[PDB]
Design a protein around this nucleic acid. Structure first.
Length: 107
DNA sequence: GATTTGATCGATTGAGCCTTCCAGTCCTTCGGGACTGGAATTTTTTTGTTCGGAGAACTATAATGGGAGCTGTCACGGATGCA
């Protein structure tokens, strides 16, 4: 099996258990690889970060789960990768130049 | 609820550490799928012998008419063949 098939399955791996408390080290058990072999191969194809990749969409899916539902932000930290809200809001201001609170108020 | 700061898990990746994925080439080895001579075997028809079989003429005292066990009791009738 060539390597361009695996990252097609690696992105067919991730988007189904984002509401789960998921990490990179369980991907390496499911893909059988080591913990380090995931992060070299993503740069030949995407030229982005795969360590922050599973952390990017826990903003992007909390950009619709907070947006559609009436969920408050202090349960997003304990499940979607963090421990407190003071770090979750900072990753948003580097990505899309916004704060989480005034992200919904903009119709 | 929005942000400011210290260090540390992870690992931005960079090199550095190690055999297999598999086209099938080829190998010496060997009984199968090619039909075969030659040698054995067994009938399958063929040849022949011969004992019984079986067909056949002849048998010269004189012998000159059978019945031979039948039909033991249906009676009514419809045409018949005489008369």
């Amino acid at each position: 099996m060539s390597h361009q098939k695996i990252i097609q399955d690696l992105i067919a791996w991730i988007d189904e258990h984002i509401d789960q408390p998921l990490n990179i080290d369980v991907v390496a058990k499911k893909s059988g690889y080591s913990k380090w072999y995931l992060q070299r191969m993503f740069r030949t194809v995407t030229h982005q970060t795969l360590g922050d990749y599973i952390r990017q969409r826990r903003l992007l899916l909390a950009a619709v789960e907070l947006r559609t539902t009436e969920r408050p932000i202090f349960d997003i930290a304990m499940d979607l990768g963090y421990v407190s809200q003071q770090t979750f809001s900072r990753v948003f201001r580097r990505q899309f130049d916004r704060t989480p609170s005034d992200y919904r108020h903009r119709l």
